[PDB]
Amino acid sequence: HMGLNTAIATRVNGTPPPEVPIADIELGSLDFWALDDDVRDGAFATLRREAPISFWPTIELPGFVAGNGHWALTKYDDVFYASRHPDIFSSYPNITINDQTPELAEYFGSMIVLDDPRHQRLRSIVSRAFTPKVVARIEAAVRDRAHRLVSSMIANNPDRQADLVSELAGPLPLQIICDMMGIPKADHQRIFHWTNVILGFGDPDLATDFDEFMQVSADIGAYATALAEDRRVNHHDDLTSSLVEAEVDGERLSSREIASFFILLVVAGNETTRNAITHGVLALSRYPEQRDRWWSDFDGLAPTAVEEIVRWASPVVYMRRTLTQDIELRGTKMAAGDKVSLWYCSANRDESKFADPWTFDLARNPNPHLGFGGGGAHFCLGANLARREIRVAFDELRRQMPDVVATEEPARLLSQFIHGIKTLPVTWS
Ligand code: HEM
Ligand SMILES: CC(C)=CCC/C(C)=C/CNCCN[C@H]1[C@@H]2C[C@H]3C[C@@H](C2)C[C@@H]1C3
Ligand SMILES: [Mg+2]
Ligand SMILES: [Mg+2]
């Protein structure tokens, strides 16, 4: 093949993975989430065909309460419908499939696990900072950090080998959200370690002891509380100050509400875009013709290329809802109180919605992917920020090291919730 000698194998674009026998699919087993993407993708293809709504037991993880199982929605239309009907598909009490507990709610009782009106009143505290016009004004900050990170990949590695995750994909979004929050630079890596554990728990490379998970949670919560108290006394133009100054229903946020909001923002900002970027580099490595067509017309294709990277990566695998009333979908009766899981990873391969879903096409248009969710009340707050982080990251790679390519298959995060890559070795000429 053309390119650098140690580059990973390319793939034939458009090739569907073989569908997987349904007896080999166990969404309730961590072993299933360790299988490679080709098997996972073929398994969701089987479900879309043979069991588009199906029930599964909740995965067991140390210290978490699995509780009741869940109805898995694997078809695009059902995920879209559920997302747009929050009066039936509630975000309370939790948006992962395990049960919420009072101990967890101290740190994880943010607006993401609330319905309107309280959800929207909370979201309005920070929403202006995430609008397209306001995010556009921090292009210079995104450029400066991305440009320096790529330059540092070159300066730090005389052998021209680097880990894309630790050296670019992780640190770029980390800096941007942490600066928006008003966190001093010296603490950004501490924040990143905490969010890595929070949304890596169950992978032995991150953490498997529930006491470590709760220590991390308490530590980031205490960090948030201390920063908030500083900003209460002396305002800065940052989101932490916005949080401590706001009122909802005439009342300031409590310390639990502040901590939960801070944690939500840094976790979501740190554990999503990095995976879009890393899966995007993996895809360019497997499909060099797509790299070439983007590099030849970077600004023209960037809108569609960023969206296709998000559809392909589906960084957030699923979100959970809870029914407030009985409902029948696709011939399956589901009861008030039942858990419902929305498989964005599967919606984003649904042949009923996408022409040629197995083709990675950076010009894809239209591209109604559900990578940021199905739309409606909880539509990703960070979507404009994420799209800009992704575009800039690839533009800086294109400009400085255009032939950057993966040299090993990724080390995959063991997670049902996040489509994570822990490490991706790359090289460039
Ligand atoms: C490629 C990157 C990202 C992806 C794929 C992604 C995906 C998602 C998804 C699927 C949801 C749930 C939507 C729903 O329930 O309908 C969500 C919500 C959210 N995301 Fe993003 N996200 C990304 C980046 C970001 C960034 C960079 C931030 C910045 C802090 C962020 C902040 C949030 C927040 C706060 C919510 C909850 C919104 C609410 O409850 O109203 N996300 N995201
Ligand atoms: C990814 C976006 C868009 C928002 C982040 C939303 C947010 C802060 C979830 C915090 N959840 C705390 C419990 N989460 C952990 C447990 C349950 C799941 C499996 C294991 C154990 C790892 C985590 C997920
Ligand atoms: Mg190295
Ligand atoms: Mg600052």
Author numbering: 0 to 428
Give the published text.
CYP124 (Rv2266, CYP124A1) has previously assigned activity towards methyl-branched lipids of isoprenoid origin, while CYP125 (Rv3545c, CYP125A1) and CYP142 (Rv3518c, CYP142A1) are involved in the cholesterol catabolism. Multiple substrates have been previously identified for CYP124, including cholesterol, vitamin D, their derivatives, and methyl-branched lipids. Although its physiological function and, therefore, a natural substrate is not yet confirmed, there is a common pattern among all the substrates—a methyl-branched tail, tightly positioned for ω-hydroxylation in the distal site. SQ109 belongs to the 1,2-ethylenediamine class of anti-TB drugs, consisting of adamantane head and geranyl tail, proposed to disrupt the synthesis of the complex Mtb cell wall.
To determine the binding mode and the hydroxylation position, we co-crystallized SQ109 with CYP124. A 1.25 Å crystal structure of the CYP124–SQ109 complex reveals two close conformations of SQ109, confirming the formation of a ω-terminal hydroxy product. The 2mFo−DFc composite omit map unambiguously shows SQ109 density in two conformations, which differ only in the ethylenediamine-adamantane part. At the same time, geranyl tails in both conformations are positioned above Fe in the typical geometry for ω- hydroxylation. Distances between the heme iron and the carbon atoms of the branched methyl groups are 4.0 Å and 6.1 Å, which favorites the hydroxylation of the ω-methyl group in the trans position. Thus, CYP124 catalyzes the regio- and stereo-selective hydroxylation of SQ109. The geranyl tail is tightly enclosed in the narrow tunnel with a broadening to accommodate ω-5 methyl branching position (methyl at C3 of SQ109). In contrast, adamantane and ethylenediamine are positioned more freely in a wide cavity in the upper part of the binding pocket. The interactions of SQ109 are mostly hydrophobic (L60, F63, T96, and F212 interact with the adamantane; F107, I111, L198, L263, V266, A267, F416, and I417 fix the aliphatic chain), while in the predominant conformation (A), the drug could potentially form a weak hydrogen bond with HOH879. The absence of stabilizing H-bonds might result in the emergence of two conformations of the adamantane group.
